[PDB]
Amino acid sequence: GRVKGVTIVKPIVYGNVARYFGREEDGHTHQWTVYVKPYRNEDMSAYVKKIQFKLHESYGNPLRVVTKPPYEITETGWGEFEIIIKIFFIDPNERPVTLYHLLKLFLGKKTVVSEFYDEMIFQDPTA
């Protein structure tokens, strides 16, 4: 399935925020949120069906799925690992997009933001 029409570029931003010292219950050191958003705000539900965040196996249930904005997963942990972000489209002939993001957690400052720009190339109907 491959389109026969106009091409659409929708820029996006993906990555995580994390805040430190946040332990007795479970030894965890950080809260973090991993996310995908549009570069400029828009209702990304117009074309995104759902976004999967595949976590490290140390998480119970490493497969996380979000279907409505904001496309984010918040968690606590002790470690950095690579997260696979897979974006699925409403249109069944627009193939999914797979992103990879190294979760960053960590000396005086408490918060970290690791954020990348990308672009989804959809193809639109040729109205």
Binding site: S58, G79, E80, F81, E82, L105
Partner: peptide
């Protein structure tokens, strides 16, 4: 896979 603390 790899997951590493500070």
């Amino acid at each position: 896979a790899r997951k590493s603390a500070p």
